[PDB]
Each structure stands twice: as C-alpha cells, then as structure tokens.
C-alpha cells in the first residue's frame, strides 16, 4: 500500500466534513447527493422547517428537494416509503441498548395514532423503534416532541453510525459480565453530539454498526458488527478487546475479525472515534457494494488499518489484544422470555413475545401501562423484536400473568415463535421482494401445529438480499425471492438457509434450497425440524 493511499480524503469545512476536491472522481451517486447539499443542515441549521412546508408534489419536481426527502432526511431518521406508502415516512430512533420509558412509548404511540391505518410501529433487529405514517408537514413538530421526551432520531439511516446494541439484560442479570448501558449511552451521545448532531461522523462511506458485549450469551451479536467491544481484563485492568468489520450485504457476509487491540474501559469513545475517523478519511467511495469498512480492512490489511486507528488515538496509544476475554465459551444461550429473577433481591424481569415485532398505538399504550403498574416505567427492546419489562417486585408477578394483554404478548408463546425474527418486507419496504411479517407468522403457526420440539430453533425471514433480518444467523433462514409454481405462474418464494449459529461458537449460514414457493414451505420446514432439530409430529 502506497503512502499516497493514506491521505485523508475528507476535510472539515464550515462545521461539516466534505470530500476534498481532488478525491471526487468516480464517486457513487449517494456521495454526489452529500456533496450537493450537506444532509446535517436539515437538522443543525433547521433546514427542515422550510422544506416541510413545500407540498410533496412540488418537492418531487426538483432533484435537490427530491433528494432531500428521499436521501438526506435519513440523517434525521426519516425514510420516505416512496414506492409502497407514498408520501409517508418511517421514522427510526437512536435507542442505545434498546432502553425506552413508558412516557417515551406513549409519545410514540400518540404520533402513530394520528395516522390511523397508515400508522403502526415496529421493533427492529437492532433493538430499536420505528414508527410509521409520518407526513412531512408534521416532521418539525415530531422532532420537537421527541426531544421533549428525551429521544433523538439523529443519524439512524444512510451513511451513519447505527443503533448501539447492548445486553438486553444489562444491570439486571445475575450472570452479566458488565453493564453495557453506560457504554452504549456514551456511544450514542458521541455519535449524535448529545442529540445536536455530530458532523464528524455523519459523512461515512457507508453505514456502520456498533455493539458492546456484556453477556456470556452474546445477545449482542458481536460477530456481525462493524465494531464490537468484547469485555476483557488485560494486565489486571478492565477493558475491551476489539472486533472489526463484521457486516452483511447482498454481495458478501463476513464475521468481524480481531483488530488485535485492547482498550481500557474509559477509552470506549476515543477508540470508536479513531476507528470512524480512519473509515471516514480513507474508505472507498465507489461501488456502494464495496464501501463497508471490511473492504478498507482488506485493502490495507488488518495491520495497516490498525496503524490508522492507532495514529488517531490520544497519545497515539493502542495496546494489543488481551490473550483472553471474559466471555465464557462454556455457555448455552438463555431464553429471556418469561419471568426471571434479577440480581436485585425481590425483583424480576419479564420477557414478552411481540409477534414479528409489530405493534399498534393501543398496544404501545398498554405495554407502557404495564411497565408503570408493574415495573419502573421501563420497556426494553430486543434484537429478536421482543420486549423485556424489568424491575418488577416479584410479589406482583401473579397478578401480572393474569393481565389480558399477555394473551397477545405472551411470556410463554410456543417455542418457534420465541425465536422468530422478520424484517419489514413489502408492506412498507420498497426493496422487498415478498411480504414477510404476516407470511412468517402464518407459516410458523402452521408448522408448530404439526410438530412439537424442545430445541430453541431460530427462524429468520428477510424480504430481499439486504438481509436486515439476518438470515445468515438463523437455524432456518428464509430470503424472499420470486419463483414459479407447477404451472409456471409467478409466486412469492424463499431461498432457505441453514447453518447459522450464534453465541461464542458463531457461524454464518448459507443457502440450502433455492426458490421454494412460500405455499410449499410448511412441509419442507416440518421435515427439516423433525430430521435435524429433534421435532416430533403431533
């Protein structure tokens, strides 16, 4: 690698970071959008106020403003559903560690309630909230309303640092390694500039996913994050070994690799900053399929990339990885659904199944009511698109289990539902090839009617090769495709994946059988469960 390759390609100009004039050749169209107008100005210079007043039909008549609503608004967490729900915006938060309050939940419910049939909300595979139905004229008021209740939607889409994932049992599990909340909180504060915007990390070549591990279970999926903090003691000091570059895409899925770096616990933010600066400064900005950070690591080599991180650390210090980390390889991932005692004597948490992560406003209000009546007004989201209500006095559990809403959001649903994960799909997502959420529920219900089993089989449904629902981690994964029935008619189908493992002994699954019509999946899956996962026909 020539020394010229290491020249930073972006520069700070008037509070924002822009590609240098000599590093603009051959850039992709998204890079051109970012140069044409700085997306962060919509928030930081209140550009949204005037934009929101322009009728959408008028907005669509010019490239600049159409790009504002279709692309730049993703820096404010707003996602125009142009193809499948025209004129409506999905809105996505920052929610470090998946932690929400009842007041925040009620606020979000109040926003979606306004939109009637166009509104609903979803828990995401980064333990985050998305709300739906938003119209552009309401955006300024919603941004103000979010801030009022202590929420931000900043930098949650496009070429930004995505939701910092942590241990859903942080602070409450007797078996936790380290409470991840302080760290994910710090990361989110750093990323968003304390909810004011942080332009230093908002012009990346591509999206970038961070997580902080605090569980032996590895609930945080460190193997598939761009930066994963693995708790590790080194030379008598608590800190983190760092894994880098994990990612999924249509073209390529790769597990994170060791940076060969350990940082003291207090250096979590400094090293996040150093890694992001190196990625921002040096990353490829051509073909979008080759812009994730792993591609830079491969170009420089991991040692070459490490040197770039090291030079950007305070005092240019970056220790080598600790020989061992604190995560115990002797471990079985634990079910968190149901009632579990906390480390605080006399308290329990309850994990509740949210079918395919989908809720309506009334459901949100009810969950918020439960968290207030039974817990501490806290609702935690999980990456399987479920919830945990922590901090419940154990003597209240008997009454809680009788609450009518628990018949819908159950502490003990059938085992296949416990592990079911599904992306948005074509109800709202323009890239989706198939409908996912309704279909996956229907198929799973039919499968479980036919077989019983005791193994916690994890089934993931994703609507297109972007694999937002992570089919490569599943015991059985389903990737949307179009295929053909016996008469040659177009039908929805799935490419079926097998081989995904999570926890310490992680492994990426691969296509097992292509082009299976969705209407033919039940017998295939029933047989796979009996033959490979110990299921028994009813």
Phi, psi of 79 (to 5 degrees): -125, 105
Any binding-site annotation on 291?
Answer: no
Decide which of K ion, ligand O=N[O-], Cl ion, none touches 15; Cβ closer than 5 to 8 Å per partner kind: none
Compare residues 55 and 430 and give the one whose CB is closer to ligand SRM. 430
Number of residues engaging ligand O=N[O-] in binding (CB under 6 A): 3
Contact call for residue 152 and ligand SRM (CB under 6 A):
no
Find the distance separating the first CA and the last CA of the chain, reported in whole Å. Answer: 61
- H/E run at residue 365: helix 361-374
Any binding-site annotation on 207?
Answer: yes
Contact call for residue 221 and ligand O=N[O-] (CB under 6 A):
no
Contact call for residue 40 and ligand O=N[O-] (CB under 6 A):
no
Contact call for residue 306 and ligand O=N[O-] (CB under 6 A):
no
Q: Which neighbouring-strand residues pair with 513?
A: 496
**Span interacting with ligand SRM, options 180-188, 242-250, 322-330, 401-409, rule CB under 6 A:** 242-250
Any binding-site annotation on 206?
Answer: yes
Compare residues 164 and 517 and give the one whose CB is closer to ligand O=N[O-]. 164
Contact call for residue 386 and K ion (CB under 5 A):
yes
Contact call for residue 295 and ligand SRM (CB under 6 A):
no
Residue 463 CB, nearest distance to ligand SF4 (Å)?
Answer: 3
Contact call for residue 467 and ligand SRM (CB under 6 A):
yes
Q: Which neighbouring-strand residues pair with 339?
A: 350
Any binding-site annotation on 380?
Answer: no
Compare residues 207 and 312 and give the one whose CB is closer to ligand O=N[O-]. 207
Residues 6+ apart with CB under 8 A from 538: 449, 450, 451, 452
Residue 502 CB, nearest distance to ligand SRM (Å)?
Answer: 12
Any binding-site annotation on 128?
Answer: yes
Any binding-site annotation on 253?
Answer: no
Decide which of ligand SF4, Cl ion, ligand O=N[O-], none touches 431; Cβ closer than 5 to 8 Å per partner kind: ligand SF4
Decide which of Cl ion, K ion, ligand SF4, none touches 385; Cβ closer than 5 to 8 Å per partner kind: K ion
Q: Is the dihedral of CA 429, 114, 194, 261 positive or negative?
A: negative
Any binding-site annotation on 120?
Answer: no
Angle at the Cα of 100 from the Cα atoms of 97 and 103, rounded to 5 degrees? 165
How many angstroms separate the CA atoms of 158 and 73, rounded? 9
* DSSP per-residue string spanning 112-166: HHTTGGG-EEEE-TTS-EEEEEE-GGGHHHHHHHHHHTT-B-TT-SSSSB---B-
* Contact status, residue 460 vs residue 423, Cβ threshold 8 Å: no
How many angstroms separate the CA atoms of 151 and 260, rounded? 35
* Contact status, residue 351 vs residue 387, Cβ threshold 8 Å: yes
Q: Which of residues 140-199 bind ligand O=N[O-] (CB under 6 A)?
A: 157
Selected from 294, 361, 379, 468, the binder of ligand O=N[O-] by CB under 6 A is 468
Contact call for residue 30 and ligand SRM (CB under 6 A):
no
Kindly list the distances between the CA atom of residue 4 and the CA atoms of 1, 7, 97, 272, in Å, as whole numbers in the listed order: 8, 6, 39, 24
Contact call for residue 208 and ligand SRM (CB under 6 A):
no
Query: What is the bridge-based pairing of β-strands 10-13 and 16-19?
Result: antiparallel
Any binding-site annotation on 162?
Answer: no
Any binding-site annotation on 382?
Answer: no
Residue 37 CB, nearest distance to ligand SF4 (Å)?
Answer: 25
* Interface ranges with ligand SF4 (CB under 6 A): 423-425, 429, 431-432, 462-464, 466-469
Any binding-site annotation on 481?
Answer: no
Residue 479 CB, nearest distance to ligand SF4 (Å)?
Answer: 8
> 511-515: long-range contacts at Cβ-Cβ below 8 A with a sequence spacing of 24 or more?
511/479, 514/481, 515/481, 515/483, 515/484
Contact call for residue 97 and K ion (CB under 5 A):
no
Contact call for residue 207 and ligand O=N[O-] (CB under 6 A):
yes
Any binding-site annotation on 65?
Answer: no
Contact call for residue 312 and ligand O=N[O-] (CB under 6 A):
no
Any binding-site annotation on 285?
Answer: no
Residues 6+ apart with CB under 8 A from 350: 338, 339, 340, 374, 388, 389, 392, 397, 400, 411
Residue 251 CB, nearest distance to ligand SRM (Å)?
Answer: 7
Residues 6+ apart with CB under 8 A from 379: 100, 101, 102, 105, 367, 368, 371, 387, 388, 389
35: helix, coil or strand?
Answer: helix
Q: Which of residues 108-137 bind ligand SRM (CB under 6 A)?
A: 122, 124-126, 128, 130
Selected from 385, 436, 448, 472, the binder of K ion by CB under 5 A is 385
CB neighbours of residue 247 within 10 Å = 20
Contact call for residue 200 and ligand SRM (CB under 6 A):
no
Look at residues 7, 23, 8 and name the one whose alpha carbon lies nearest to residue 285.
Answer: 23
Phi, psi of 95 (to 5 degrees): -145, 70
Decide which of Cl ion, ligand SF4, ligand SRM, none touches 130; Cβ closer than 5 to 8 Å per partner kind: ligand SRM
Residues 6+ apart with CB under 8 A from 346: 393, 394, 395
Phi, psi of 283 (to 5 degrees): -60, 140
Binding-site positions for [4Fe-4S] cluster? 423, 429, 464, 468
Binding site for Cl ion (CB under 5 A): 82-83, 157-158, 430
Binding site for ligand O=N[O-] (CB under 6 A): 157, 207, 468
């Amino acid at each position: 690698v020539a020394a010229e390759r290491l020249e930073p390609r972006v520069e700070e100009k008037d509070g924002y970071w822009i590609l240098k004039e000599q590093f603009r050749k051959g850039i992709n169209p998204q890079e051109k959008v970012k140069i044409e107008k700085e997306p962060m100005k919509l928030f930081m210079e209140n550009g949204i106020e005037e934009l929101a007043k322009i009728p959408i039909e008028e907005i669509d008549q010019s490239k600049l403003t159409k790009d504002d609503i279709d692309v730049r608004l993703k820096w404010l967490g707003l996602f125009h559903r142009r193809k499948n729900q025209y004129g409506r915006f999905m809105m996505r938060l920052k929610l470090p560690n998946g932690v929400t309050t009842s007041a925040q939940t009620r606020y979000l419910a109040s926003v979606i309630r306004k939109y009637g049939k166009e509104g609903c909300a979803d828990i995401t595979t980064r333990q985050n909230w998305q709300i739906r139905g938003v119209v552009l004229p309401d955006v300024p008021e919603i941004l103000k309303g979010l801030a009022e209740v202590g929420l931000t939607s900043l930098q949650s889409g496009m070429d930004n640092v995505r939701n910092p994932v942590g241990n859903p049992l942080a602070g409450i599990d007797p078996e936790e390694i380290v409470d991840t909340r302080p760290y994910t909180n710090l990361l989110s504060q750093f990323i968003t500039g304390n909810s004011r915007g942080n332009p230093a990390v908002s012009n990346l070549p591509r999206k970038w996913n961070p997580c902080v591990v605090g569980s032996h279970d590895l609930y945080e999926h460190p193997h598939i994050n761009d930066l994963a903090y693995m708790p590790a003691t080194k030379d008598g000091r608590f800190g983190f070994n760092l894994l880098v570059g994990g990612f999924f895409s249509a073209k390529r899925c790769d597990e994170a690799i060791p940076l060969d770096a350990w940082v003291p616990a207090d250096d979590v933010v400094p090293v996040c900053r150093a890694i992001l600066e190196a990625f921002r400064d040096l990353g490829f900005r051509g073909n979008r399929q080759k812009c994730r950070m792993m591609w830079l690591i491969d170009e420089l080599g991991v040692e070459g990339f490490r040197a770039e991180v090291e030079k950007r650390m305070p005092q240019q210090q970056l220790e080598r990885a600790s020989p061992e980390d604190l995560v115990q390889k002797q471990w079985e991932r634990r079910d968190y659904l149901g009632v579990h005692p906390q480390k605080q004597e006399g308290y329990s948490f309850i994990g509740l199944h949210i079918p395919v992560g989908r809720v309506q406003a009334d459901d949100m209000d009810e969950l918020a009511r439960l968290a207030d009546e039974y817990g501490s007004g806290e609702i935690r989201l999980t990456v399987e698109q479920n919830i945990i209500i922590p901090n419940i006095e154990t003597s209240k559990i008997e009454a809680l289990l009788k609450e009518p809403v628990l018949s819908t959001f159950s502490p003990d649903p059938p085992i296949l539902m416990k592990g079911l994960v599904a992306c948005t799909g074509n109800q709202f997502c323009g890239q989706a090839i198939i409908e996912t959420k309704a279909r996956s529920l229907k198929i799973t219900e039919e499968v479980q009617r036919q077989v019983s089993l005791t193994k916690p089989v994890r089934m993931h449904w994703t609507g297109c090769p972007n694999t937002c629902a992570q089919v490569q981690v599943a015991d059985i994964g389903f990737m949307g495709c179009l295929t053909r029935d016996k008469n040659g008619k177009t039908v929805e189908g799935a490419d079926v994946f097998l081989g995904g493992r999570i926890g310490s002994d992680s492994h990426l699954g691969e296509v097992y059988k292509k082009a299976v019509p969705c209407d033919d999946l039940v017998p295939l899956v029933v047989d796979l469960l009996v033959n490979n996962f110990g299921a028994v026909p009813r």
